[PDB]
Amino acid sequence: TTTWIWDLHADAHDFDSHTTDLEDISRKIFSAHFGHLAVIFLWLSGMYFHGARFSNFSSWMTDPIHIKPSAQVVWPIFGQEILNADMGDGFRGIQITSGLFQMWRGEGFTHEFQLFWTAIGALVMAALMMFAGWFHYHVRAPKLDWFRNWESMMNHHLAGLLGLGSLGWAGHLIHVALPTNKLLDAGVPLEDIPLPHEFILNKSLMVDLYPSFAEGVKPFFTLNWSAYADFLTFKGGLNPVTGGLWMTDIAHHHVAIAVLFIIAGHFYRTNWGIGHSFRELLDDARTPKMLPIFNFIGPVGHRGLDKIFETSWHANLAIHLVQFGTASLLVAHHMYAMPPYPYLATDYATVTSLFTHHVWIAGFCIVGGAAHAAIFLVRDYNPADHVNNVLDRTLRHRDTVVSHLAWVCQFLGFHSFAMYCHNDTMRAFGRPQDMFSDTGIQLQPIFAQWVQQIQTMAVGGVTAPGLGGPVSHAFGGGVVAIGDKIAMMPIQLGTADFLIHHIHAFTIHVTVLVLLKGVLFSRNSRLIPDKGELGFRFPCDGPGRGGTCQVSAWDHVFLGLFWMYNSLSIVIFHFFWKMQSDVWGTVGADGTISHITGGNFAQASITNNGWLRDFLWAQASQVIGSYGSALSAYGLFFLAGHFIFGFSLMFLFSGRGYWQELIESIVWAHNKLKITTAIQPRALSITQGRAVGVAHYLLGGIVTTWAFFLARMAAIG
Amino acid sequence: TLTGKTPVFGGSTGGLLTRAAVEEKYAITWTSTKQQVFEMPTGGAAIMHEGENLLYLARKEQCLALGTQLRSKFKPKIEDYKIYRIYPNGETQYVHPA
Amino acid sequence: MTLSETQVFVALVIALVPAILAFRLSTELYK
Amino acid sequence: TLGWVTFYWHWKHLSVWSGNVAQFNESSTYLMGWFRDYLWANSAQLINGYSPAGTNSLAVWAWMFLFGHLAWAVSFMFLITWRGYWQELIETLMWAHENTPLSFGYPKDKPVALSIVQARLVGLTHFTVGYIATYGAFLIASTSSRF
Amino acid sequence: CNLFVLAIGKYAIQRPGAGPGLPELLATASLGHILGAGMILGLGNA
Amino acid sequence: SHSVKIYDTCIGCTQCVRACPLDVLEMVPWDGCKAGSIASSPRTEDCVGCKRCETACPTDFLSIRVYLGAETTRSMGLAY
Amino acid sequence: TWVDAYDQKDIIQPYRGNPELGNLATPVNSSNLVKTYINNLPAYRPGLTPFLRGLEIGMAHGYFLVGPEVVVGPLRETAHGANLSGLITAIYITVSACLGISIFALATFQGDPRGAYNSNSPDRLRPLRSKDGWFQLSGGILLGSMGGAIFAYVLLENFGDLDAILRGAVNV
Amino acid sequence: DMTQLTGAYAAPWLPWIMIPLIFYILPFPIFAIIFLWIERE
Amino acid sequence: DMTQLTGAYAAPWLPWIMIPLIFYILPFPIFAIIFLWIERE
Ligand code: F6C
Ligand code: CLA
Ligand code: CLA
Ligand SMILES: CC1=C(/C=C/C(C)=C/C=C/C(C)=C/C=C/C=C(C)/C=C/C=C(C)/C=C/C2=C(C)CCCC2(C)C)C(C)(C)CCC1
Ligand SMILES: CCCCCCCCCCCCO[C@@H]1O[C@H](CO)[C@@H](O[C@H]2O[C@H](CO)[C@@H](O)[C@H](O)[C@H]2O)[C@H](O)[C@H]1O
Ligand SMILES: CC1=C(C/C=C(\C)CCC[C@H](C)CCC[C@H](C)CCCC(C)C)C(=O)c2ccccc2C1=O
Ligand code: SF4
Ligand SMILES: [Ca+2]
């Protein structure tokens, strides 16, 4: 039947679904990770090759204020060469929003052969990854005690991967990227920029940019580190030429975290007696050894948990996908407010796209962390290992956890969203004094305003005397302007910011509620006492007990994907409106700031009608008025994303029993004309129809926001 | 009329409720040859005793899912489990095996 | 100048901590 | 289907009544023309029925417009999420009520999730109410404010 | 130097696994260079 | 309660009795098939309606049919 | 590996010593501080008549329910209007809640009740087990919450003279 | 005329009392009557 | 200033409520709690 075709592509990469031997499972995982590294190196080879061959990068490096970055040219077939837009400088292409040019300028790239030899090195190292995956599987695969050496793996990845990676990048910053960006910010044209090996061969050429280099590596070994305080600086603020962070703060950052990570890579005991072991740290976290505030975790505590990490790859994937969500969320929030690349903060199409991308990467990773947490509890969890420890006691009060979470989701939905419905009703009545607003009933976010005042008072310098400028200009300080364009200014928080932050707290808590109830009730419940015996992924247990549709832990990941999408859409909508309204814009010749949407977030974002009219209706005029221009691919992708959203609701709202009885009549008509095939035509399964419906829903909604974000910012940003 | 040690268990939030005292209750009794860990149908791990056990549960499906685990997850198998239905007046009816 | 209104409210909130710790010392000393 | 019918009747007649019957003729042959010139262009005074600039006589139709968008979205909860998600959530709420002090109420009828057929009907009812209150507010407010 | 002498004077007291000796000397010398660098820079500005 | 009907196409493979998580079904001697036994449903007031027995039936069409009837506390599967 | 589990002392115990019950004995539901406080609240205080339970519950509740509409309600621009709208809000909530208490008792106590008010129910948290206890609690909550609301109304309507009392301005 | 609800029709006190009666005075007694009808045994 | 109790310090409404609470609102509940503690059997 046709179900075998869909089941084969779904049974592809789960390895314990075959014969479960952990050493052979761990070897297929270790060599597939080499293959995914070869895919990343092949994709990195493309971005450096298209940056070296199909770009305006040498033209953009002359004057990065008035030149738009392009790195994709389009062939002249079917009339599709209209998308090759003028970027300035006579170059016709597609305006890229990834920010590769701002990344390459800060790293020290100056020509299009340096990007070429980086593309060759990524093409070489991709072939080295698909040899190491062949060698460490088909020739000399390791065995299970090598995979179980946590203390050696933690020591080698803290000190060796992160410590030597950022120390080695601090070598590239100090000897290549600090002189190249110091000459560029002091206005030196690119014929006169020395090639980056001449800052090492001609050592005297770095002496006049940094006089501490004449005194050599000798103050480092004698701990006279204050001699170096002109290329490793604790400045803060932004560069007034580029808008990026100070490159001497970036170098001293990657020096200080290098020492902190190499120190961290000596914490664990491997072969020499010195260090902590993972088992002794976990077997001691229990009563009576903990604090008396934590007496509730009981006498076993964390004692049975090391057998999880001995046996379960899914449980480690659950933690690591969560922390890649934590890292990518930090990358989103910290790179808009402390922009680390030159001429990044005033490229508004790039700041929009970089925040939105790394928010969405983080939200899929968090759902995957909850998905593979439920796979561990169904497949890998053995209850004999966990008697009265913190895993067993969590499963024994799951009714208190879910019902307390269900209450706080209802509290947050009333006391965030229903206050917008209060505000919609009060404004329609003509009672603006009765609204939750800065001019009505104020809800000042006083704890976030207090932190902003602390973050400003810290630099001067009550608690951090070492800075000159602020950590970020979003906290306080002043307006940074690059090319009469705002790079970063203080972001004022009012009643509109109190309300949208409690919307975020509401939509995250519900997304936790869908995912945590799926994990905590994955093995059994009061409804299905043998739910773990039915598997991780199954449609239901029949129409009985009232109806048991979507009880499986897979279907909670299915519902959690919609709620993650609903949560992160409001997050990027909060970002896109507030940056256009209160941050981005133009410093006039008068001295006054005229923002993009003119400061309308404080009064219009407090109702649903203002989000519909002033955000959704007003700002989508660029994407719907793009037909017959160079932004017309965004206008086509805008309607294409609307199509797949409506198309997804056929799979989500219907069931396969209709479609199987519809197929028998078309099977009948194919049999009357004698053209039957052997593989028998089946409707999709109940889980396949849910997986297709959620994939097309998320694809339809994200492509629509992507076309709306990028058509507006490529026109007016 | 029902003999057995209660399994070693710290209690949970998935156990007996108001329905167990006012409508009907269920008890599963089995003998074990060793002290070993089983999974409760209400969530969590309990320790059965060597010899005769007795566990009160809320639904008949929870007792039969426990008896399925006793027959399938332990070597040697535990097949001798008996399931009773207890009414609020103390009237106990032997329902499995019938 | 003397204290501000936020300084007085900080002292009132902090003083709940020895209020709770004196309650648990009193009930531990005995009934 | 009746959406496609009444969209065509309204956009053809809004072009005839305004004298701009030509503008229907180039724009109705591609789907962006329905999106830009019928849906987006005629929403302008409807969603300005109340604003920070004030309120006017289209405010009940602007409020019903969002009301219809809200009922259509509540519909998707009943149509995408199915029963046994909600039935297991209600057991935790039945746990929480029985073990909370000072909550003297107790349900005479045992709380269960809505049945499989019922929430297809409840989801279709919110879909239909959300369909008609949205377009009915848009049909009144776009026609009566242009004429 | 005086922090390195402090490390060999108060960390033959703290360590359960001593001798796998050769490498807890290298640990005690490493911590002396860590606490030495923090105190020299700490006393460098007082 | 629900209604569980066993039809005379039953080959007596005992698979519906093994599949039932509520112990509704048992085998009685029949002399109407080769196995000499047929399924019966004596304890149908304990049937929750999960239709696991119909999923296990190899006869085409099924020899066991569950008809969802009046909802009781047992048939709704309520622990509260 | 699991044999010494459940041998050391734990502050989390099975509820009423029964591990088959669907609850746990925690510091929040079973410590001596929270048991002295909760069991001496007027819903649970031992020996009280059902009416006096209602009167203390009402007087506490009607007093604070005047509050929100006085300060943030639609009449808040004038003092006399805000106090009246806060009183009417507390009156309307009280009548609605006491109507709910009465129709709960009329629906529940029909023969042997189902659930927590059955004769076999060991529900310590729901001890008002007869319908005449519920109707006396309904009348107690009505009279107490009406009295507590009109007490808060009289204090807020006379706030100018009450502020002058508490600052000694009446001694001039 | 423009500051509050008035009525220039016959008996303008009728919506002054009927809308409170229909919408927030009588519904809770009607809901209570219907509740006792569907719970009685 | 000279006719009534005022306060030229931060939060002058605090003695306006604390002295009634400490001295003649809370003592009779505290005396009743202590009385039930020393009479209970
Ligand atoms: C009657 C009796 C009773 C009682 C006592 O008595 C109660 C209580 C409880 C407690 C314990 C808790 C907490 C509270 C809160 O916060 O929440 C809110 C709520 C409210 C506010 C509600 C309340 C109500 C009151 C009490 C009464 C009132 C009445 C009126 C006033 C009268 C009127 C009458 C006329 C005729 C209309 C709860 C809850 C919950 N609920 Mg539950 N209730 C009940 C009822 C009901 C019903 C009907 C339903 C369906 C709708 C439900 C539902 C629900 C859900 C979802 C949830 C949640 O989440 C929560 C929880 O769990 O956490 C944890 N629930 N709660
Ligand atoms: C200091 C030595 C060292 C370094 C640099 C690494 C680095 C890595 N290991 Mg680890 N590993 C080590 C020691 C080390 N390991 C030891 C001693 C053990 C046994 C306890 C392991 C057991 C282990 C397992 C089981 C797995 C890894 C994996 C990984 C990768 C992490 C996932 C990833 O994609 O990273 C992000 C990638 C980067 C940050 C880019 C830099 C990485 C380069 C491209 C690697 C190749 C260059 C070269 C070999 C490293 C520099 C050394 C050279 C100068 C001599 C990363 C390449 C995972 C993997 O993906 O395997 C393929 C994995 O599954 N390691
Ligand atoms: C490092 C990250 C990582 C790793 C190693 C795994 C690995 C695994 N996952 Mg997990 N998972 C992850 C992240 C990861 N996942 C994330 C981020 C999510 C949230 C979405 C999940 C949610 C999840 C679920 C719900 C399930 C798994 C399952 C699995 C297992 C089998 C996968 C398979 O066969 O699919 C093969 C791959 C496919 C079938 C490709 C389909 C992917 C989408 C639908 C298409 C891509 C859309 C594309 C981007 C849009 C472009 C459209 C355009 C081309 C037209 C395998 C162990 C399954 C399992 O069997 O566990 C027991 C399972 O049921 N995962
Ligand atoms: C903080 C805290 C808490 C809480 C508390 C609270 C929450 C409070 C409340 C309070 C309140 C809530 C109060 C109330 C009061 C009331 C009153 C006291 C009333 C009175 C009344 C009266 C006096 C009246 C009278 C009358 C009548 C009856 C009739 C006629 C008329 C008149 C008016 C004369 C606790 C303990 C938990 C813990 C610790 C801490
Ligand atoms: C999850 C978070 C929970 C949110 C809970 C929200 C509940 C409702 C919030 C109202 C409480 C605070 O509301 C606070 O009330 C006062 C009194 O009206 C308002 O006061 C303001 O408007 C009123 C208008 O008459 C004026 O009298 C006053 O001069 C002015 O400052 C404040 O702007 C507001 O900050
Ligand atoms: C539409 C729909 C179907 C029908 C969808 C089907 C049958 C999918 C058919 C897709 C295949 C891939 C069509 C193409 C067939 C051949 C692969 C064609 C070959 C073409 C190549 C040569 C390009 C379901 O089966 C279903 C099941 C459960 C819930 C909802 C739904 C649902 O909504
Ligand atoms: S409707 Fe579909 S998913 Fe729901 S119980 Fe029936 S077969 Fe299962
Ligand atoms: Ca007002």
Author numbering:
A (entry chain aA): 44 to 503, 528 to 784
B (entry chain aD): 4 to 101
C (entry chain cM): 1 to 31
D (entry chain aB): 596 to 742
E (entry chain aK): 35 to 54, 68 to 93
F (entry chain aC): 2 to 81
G (entry chain aL): 8 to 179
H (entry chain aI), I (entry chain cI): 3 to 43
Copy text from the publication.
Among the two photosystems, PSI catalyzes the light-driven electron transfer from the plastocyanin (or cytochrome c6) at the lumenal side of the thylakoid membranes to ferredoxin at the stromal side. The PsaA and PsaB subunits bind Chl a/Chl a′ as the primary electron donor (P700), and A0 (Chl), A1 (quinone), and Fx (4Fe-4S cluster) as the electron acceptors. Here we analyzed the high-resolution structures of the PSI core complexes from H. hongdechloris grown under white (white PSI) and far-red (far-red PSI) light conditions by cryo-electron microscopy (cryo-EM). We purified the trimeric PSI cores from H. hongdechloris grown under white and far-red light conditions and solved their structures by cryo-EM single particle analyses at resolutions of 2.35 and 2.41 Å, respectively.
In the atomic model of the far-red PSI, each monomer contains six membrane-spanning subunits (PsaA, PsaB, PsaI, PsaK, PsaL, and PsaM) and three stromal subunits (PsaC, PsaD, and PsaE). However, we identified seven molecules of Chl f (f826A, f827A, f830A, f832A, f844A, f810B, and f825B) in the monomer of the far-red PSI based on the difference density maps calculated between the cryo-EM experimental maps of the white PSI and that of the far-red PSI, as well as between the cryo-EM experimental map of the far-red PSI and the calculated density map derived from the atomic models of the far-red PSI with all Chls assigned as Chl a. Other cofactors in the far-red PSI include 83 Chl a, 16 β-carotene, 3 [4Fe-4S] cluster, 2 phylloquinones and 2 lipid molecules in a monomer. Among them, five Chl f (f826A, f827A, f830A, f832A, and f844A) are coordinated by PsaA and the other two Chl f (f810B and f825B) are coordinated by PsaB. However, we found that all of the seven Chl f molecules are located at the periphery region of the PSI core as well as in the interfacing regions among the PSI monomers, and all RC Chls, including the special pair, A−1, and A0, are Chl a molecules in the far-red PSI. In the PsaA subunit, loop1 (Ala232-Asp244) located at the lumenal side of white PSI was deleted in the far-red PSI, whereas loop2 (Pro331-Asn338) is inserted in the far-red PSI, which was found to be located at the stromal side. In the PsaL subunit, loop3 (Thr8-Leu28) and loop4 (Gln117-Pro134) are inserted in the far-red PSI, which are located at the stromal side in the structure. At the Chl f826A-binding site, W367 and W371 of PsaA in the white PSI are changed to I362 and Q366 with relatively smaller side chains in the far-red PSI; among them, Q366 is hydrogen-bonded to the oxygen atom of the formyl group of f826A with a distance of 3.2 Å. At the f844A-binding site, V699 of PsaB in the white PSI is changed to G700 in the far-red PSI, with its main chain nitrogen associated with the oxygen atom of the formyl group of f844A at 2.9 Å.
